[PDB]
Amino acid sequence: QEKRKQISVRGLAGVENVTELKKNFNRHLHFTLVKDRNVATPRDYYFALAHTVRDHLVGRWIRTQQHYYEKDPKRIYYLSLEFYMGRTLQNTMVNLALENACDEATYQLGLDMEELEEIEEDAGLGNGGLGRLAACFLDSMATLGLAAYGYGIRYEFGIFNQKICGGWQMEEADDWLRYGNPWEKARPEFTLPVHFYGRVEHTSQGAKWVDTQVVLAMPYDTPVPGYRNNVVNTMRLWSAKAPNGYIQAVLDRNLAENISRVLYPNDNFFEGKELRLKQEYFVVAATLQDIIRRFKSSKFRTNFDAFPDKVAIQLNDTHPSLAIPELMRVLVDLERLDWDKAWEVTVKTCAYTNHTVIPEALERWPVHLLETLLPRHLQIIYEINQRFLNRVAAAFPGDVDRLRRMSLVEEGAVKRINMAHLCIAGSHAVNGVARIHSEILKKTIFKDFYELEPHKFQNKTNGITPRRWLVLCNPGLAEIIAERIGEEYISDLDQLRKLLSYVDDEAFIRDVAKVKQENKLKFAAYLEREYKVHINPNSLFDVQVKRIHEYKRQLLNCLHVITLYNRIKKEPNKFVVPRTVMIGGKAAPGYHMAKMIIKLITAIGDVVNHDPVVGDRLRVIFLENYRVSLAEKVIPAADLSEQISTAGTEASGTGNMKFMLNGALTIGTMDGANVEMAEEAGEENFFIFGMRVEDVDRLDQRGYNAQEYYDRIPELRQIIEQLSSGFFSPKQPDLFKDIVNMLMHHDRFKVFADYEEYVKCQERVSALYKNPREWTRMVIRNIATSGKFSSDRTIAQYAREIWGVEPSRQRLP
Amino acid sequence: QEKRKQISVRGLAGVENVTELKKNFNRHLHFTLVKDRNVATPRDYYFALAHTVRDHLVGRWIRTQQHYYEKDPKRIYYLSLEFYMGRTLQNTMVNLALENACDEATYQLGLDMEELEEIEEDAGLGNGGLGRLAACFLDSMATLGLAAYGYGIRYEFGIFNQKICGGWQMEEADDWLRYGNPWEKARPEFTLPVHFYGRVEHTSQGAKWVDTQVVLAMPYDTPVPGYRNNVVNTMRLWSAKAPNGYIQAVLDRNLAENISRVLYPNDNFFEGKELRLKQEYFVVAATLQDIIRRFKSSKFRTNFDAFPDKVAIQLNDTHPSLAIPELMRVLVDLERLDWDKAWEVTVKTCAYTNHTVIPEALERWPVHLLETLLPRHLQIIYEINQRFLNRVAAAFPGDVDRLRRMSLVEEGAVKRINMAHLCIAGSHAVNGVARIHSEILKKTIFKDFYELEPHKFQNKTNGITPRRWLVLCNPGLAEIIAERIGEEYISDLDQLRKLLSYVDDEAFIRDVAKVKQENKLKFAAYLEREYKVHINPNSLFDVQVKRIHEYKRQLLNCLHVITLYNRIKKEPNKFVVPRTVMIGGKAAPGYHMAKMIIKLITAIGDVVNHDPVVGDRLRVIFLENYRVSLAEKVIPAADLSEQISTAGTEASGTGNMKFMLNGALTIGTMDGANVEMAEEAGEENFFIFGMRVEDVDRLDQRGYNAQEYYDRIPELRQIIEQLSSGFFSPKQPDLFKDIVNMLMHHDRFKVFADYEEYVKCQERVSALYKNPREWTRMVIRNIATSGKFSSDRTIAQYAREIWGVEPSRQRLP
Ligand SMILES: O=C1NC(=O)[C@@]2(N1)O[C@H](CO)[C@@H](O)[C@H](O)[C@H]2O
Ligand SMILES: O=C1NC(=O)[C@@]2(N1)O[C@H](CO)[C@@H](O)[C@H](O)[C@H]2O
């Protein structure tokens, strides 16, 4: 209670507030939960607290939304098929300044608030970085006072819960709604219809989309609180409902209700299932009906010319790209605008954000599927394509191959629509998510488009919210910073640059170190308690946590780990800096190599963790079920952050920024936002290694030959021979033959090309770690220059450079 | 507001209570609903009222349940696959004495409480009489202070909503949960597992049921308030949940969740679907786990001998009959009791109520299905059968045909288990639901069983609650009665016999008549408003409302209606008492003849209602979507109650009692509880006609020949010739050929045999109706002798004669 008390960033425990909070906790326990103190469990107490905390959002939510309707500012509609929100109780209390008051109120009731917070399920409606970016963006938009609306789908099952059984991943449905969600509000009264299939009738009123099947879209609205500004915006997620022999017809309502059943668990990989396309159109269609209704009730041919002055649609990836043709369908077929005026409006309303580089991560839907499911949309896409290729032909006359490359329609045995090209043609702005990625979009990936319309192309380096990713998850660090520079940095993170004044301050050096040690102790206690794994608290915590994907190269980290193990065995008496290497992350079901990688991590640990010569000098653990609530516990405890993707493959990364803000040093390639992070802190304060993008390209030009590296590096050959001969799988000697085959003959990500410099860089890490004072001084140089990586900076640049609206920190009454 | 005010039976509007109710309405509107007075609709105001009213049930619910756990009285478990509860807001306010206070509170807020009550959806978890009996029984059990628990299944879809399209029934899913159910409380924490399929392993610990598939049973608990006694019991309904490639496995969770999806819409007809058997075992299995847990936490080999002293299981029909073998399975396989002691306990715990006569309404499950789905239960049933047939053989030595007739196992191409015989063997009491039906169970249907164990056989004449079926639905009548004899009759209905003192009281005669006229005006306004049908308010309202079934003979009512029409056309100048004949009721989907009957009613109206000679002297309407909330509006408005089943087919009826309590006179056969109703009022005050059961049997003995009636009755022949030649279906002349064929050659219910006496009796009705004073005096003789038909009388006799517990009207603090 004592540290919680002491933490001034957690606010005040005013005596009347504490009294009111207690009263309301007991009121909810009785009237809402219908429980009594003799039978109540810790889960019942968590719900009573959550309902109490929620009541504090209500007046601000109704007043904020009423303010927008009165004032009529331009509205921002952020459309996304993922929102990885995490848990909400602590975030709500931080943003409303209720944390110490609730801590005191619950303490007076005989309860431990932190134990109650652990009952909450993450809302895990996203796969990883992109879903988590959308959640940091809704927080930043509310903190910056924008009239912003996140729109998505309410999946009944989010990303699966990962169990590890016999060292392998197993997927279990994440039934996050089992005990209810006290944060959302069902809005059945605002249910709207969404159409599928059918056919187009061309008459004298234009086209008519008829004979469709209807699925209803019921919205659930969740409040999104800004940081101490009394703004509460809304996330509206749509849930699928069947329209309004006999038994079997009732049971068959499940087919339409299956649209919102489960998140597709792919990360940087397009799976073209019809059910996903349905999910996409379902979000787009219901969402554009709200946009159009709100526009018509706003101010006021008069109306649609001003539509782009009052609406921005922000497409998160191409997942909601059908908003481009759906808006044209509504404006032309239903509102009766002429095509040209409708297209003018559509392009000024929409903007697209791209988050990938790999060709197989782009959405390319078969024309036959679009024809069957959304026949009027395919007509509209072909017309969009003919007018855009007419502009290409007039700008670059006679360049026939440019027409083929830029077309929305891709040739082949199955013709497809390239949804990225559709977004570029229909948006006034296109952006990537880190300077290197935005630049490669202009130079290579979409170079023809950039040449046609260079003003469309922008950069918006990603960021993370310093509320969840510093005040909530690492209050100790938040408090020692506040002790020196006040609290303003929480909503103005560039003020962390003031911490460079303390690089030679003995107390500050002391306290940064003390906070990291406390977080390592809290993490080790969580691991012993919840998963019964024991880790050495006096070891360097070396952490690689992110989805499992060949491009992120968890395998390169495996090679390093086995190198440390083999070096210890060769020279057992030689001192080495003790390490706890932790790797965690989910594999898409169906991505075989990623599943084998998880099994290799566990298998390495099975040998390494039981070798008496190694003892506690080296431990390798796989962290099960990596997810936002676990990132909040392990990132603050980390010493080394592994950001080792092959140069050119991580479009930005965001876990890299989380670690930098939480006092870890980074070992990484010049990839994604790592380049900007190293620029901000100074490259001498980062452990950059390996090929740069120019090097990777040179290797591709002459041909990547993994055998050359195997032949020239004895230590590498040793590990490959261990893997192949069954040293890490004695009961099934050929278990890892597929990983070896890939590494030796088909590695698109050049794991062996960075092995030598990776292992050398790791040694430099270890050498600095032996000097605690200078390790900590380099940490202070990182925390103090992490300010650019606030999502408030990123959202302020979307507002000013894309949406045309000015962000504000002015408090609402 | 004025009559509402004046109605003293509606309680007091205390000034502080009105103030508190208003405060709490606004609090719920803001914090619970997240609405504000500018956007709030009548639906939002209904929910704010419902949440306010619900808060008044909470303390009594927690205190009542705590009282049982402390005091440890014998607990009554009433198991039923149907609970036709209807709407709850008004019932809750009546039982808690909040009706005038809420009426005043809402009136001060500018709202009309009666309009808000109309927003509520009936909870229509039952088909008709049997489901509605279970709901009147839960009310009576709470009013009599019993520690009773109703246990059922929470169907997502209850009985379908009936639309009439082109004069035919159409079924629509009744999505009663769309806007939520504010009355229930989800209890996910108390979810339990239910097993299916698998196989039995016989070991040295006895049998072991292994390799099963699990479906979870999540309970939802709904409060059940007694009448002004502060008792609030619980209805617990179980909801199916799946246990704890990849996408398809998540979607396939729907298969297990389909167990609680929809009510089978059959009335007096067994459909042997596997999914229904699953529904049955799901209720039984989860329910017996609660019973056993509660017993073990109660008092205290010691334990199970006292099990029948602390538990009663009441089986509503054979639908939960699997409780007999499930209890033996739990006691023998899991608790390790020996078979004999377990059977002793099981028979003293269980009791069965039978509600049907027709052979096809009895449950007979294929042994192959039971073998596949519930292999240990089939083993147990065969053992139960062998020991029971050993008792039969020792009691009646050498009677081999008795063994075949009484066996639980029925022979044939498909062998089946007769669930009624299983209940009789495993229960200490068996009862029918009206004296004539209980007697036929002993004399014919289960005569061998009665001869073996005569002490098991009982009678429990059905009843209805006078709360919903008099105070709620007909406050005007409730008030004129209270004016004379106080309010005690509401929970002691035999006090209505005091009203026989007023058969010659001019004011009372005047006011009974005035109340009926007001109800007819309210009903006619509802019909004009909601369905846009116009009825003549100065006509005799002749009402037949009940499920559509050949045995209930809506067709006999059709023949009468056409007879009136044909008699008018023959002698147009002759005065006749104007009538509005209304028939309503649902047909099971799939029951062809019942669907054709609905179409014949509409078709008759299509001719009759547009004939200028008839004008407003005769109108015939089909009332769409007959359901508990509609019965509460039309029964109080009725003048004549049609209860015309063939003698011997309606086991009791309950709509007959509703009409008697609400001031209608009855035209009926000596069938079911009609016989007891006529006994109570005096046969001179009832319009009894037709064959008695002895007559029906004599006709069966010589052979029913419908042609004889056609040949001897000119007026009947005329109608049959109209039907056959297309007079009621000119565009499709042969439309009713199937109804004619059945009537003429395959009528199991002898419609033509009662035609002549039915039409004569109807004329006697009409003659009395021409003398308003003497019609009303005969109504007073009916209302005043309706007291035996209170469900409190019926439940007091179950408590004393079957459950061994004493009912009480003592108030809880
Ligand atoms: O498909 C993707 N999943 C991601 O996490 C991703 N693209 O988007 C993120 C948010 O822009 C990026 O930071 C990450 O580099 C990229 O892989
Ligand atoms: O299967 C049935 N449905 C009914 O309504 C029924 N049996 O049960 C009721 C309740 O006991 C009876 O009143 C009714 O006569 C009988 O048909």
Side-chain angles (χ1 to χ4, degrees), chain B residues 234-296:
Chain B
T234 291
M235 181 180 61
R236 175 166 275 196
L237 296 187
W238 304 100
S239 180
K241 290 310 173 277
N244 356 49
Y246 165 71
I247 293 289
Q248 197 52 237
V250 172
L251 307 185
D252 286 352
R253 286 164 67 95
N254 297 338
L255 298 175
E257 286 166 6
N258 281 342
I259 294 172
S260 55
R261 202 76 64 190
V262 56
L263 173 64
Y264 275 85
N266 294 305
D267 190 272
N268 286 84
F269 177 81
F270 171 61
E271 177 181 7
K273 296 289 136 75
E274 191 190 23
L275 182 60
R276 175 55 178 216
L277 182 59
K278 288 180 182 187
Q279 289 187 327
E280 290 174 351
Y281 184 58
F282 173 79
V283 174
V284 156
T287 302
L288 270 62
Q289 289 169 69
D290 271 1
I291 295 179
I292 293 283
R293 173 190 43 90
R294 288 211 193 88
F295 167 78
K296 288 168 176 217

Side-chain angles (χ1 to χ4, degrees), chain B residues 118-223:
Chain B
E118 289 306 306
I119 305 287
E120 190 171 353
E121 292 288 303
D122 256 345
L125 304 192
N127 273 283
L130 179 155
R132 181 59 229 179
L133 191 81
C136 291
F137 286 1
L138 261 18
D139 169 277
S140 284
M141 289 185 301
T143 288
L144 288 184
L146 309 175
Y149 291 85
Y151 270 86
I153 175 163
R154 182 174 177 275
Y155 300 107
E156 268 186 50
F157 299 97
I159 180 65
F160 60 91
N161 275 137
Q162 174 191 67
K163 297 236 145 126
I164 302 287
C165 185
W168 301 88
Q169 159 175 307
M170 297 308 249
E171 308 90 18
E172 281 197 349
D174 155 60
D175 192 15
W176 73 291
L177 294 172
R178 176 182 153 139
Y179 296 98
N181 170 1
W183 309 111
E184 70 183 11
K185 181 62 185 75
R187 298 296 194 197
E189 56 278 24
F190 299 139
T191 291
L192 295 174
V194 176
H195 290 264
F196 285 106
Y197 300 110
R199 75 189 157 83
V200 175
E201 257 166 16
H202 298 275
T203 71
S204 188
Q205 277 305 92
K208 207 173 166 204
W209 188 17
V210 299
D211 301 340
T212 53
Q213 286 175 57
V214 175
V215 177
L216 294 184
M218 163 177 174
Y220 286 77
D221 287 350
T222 293

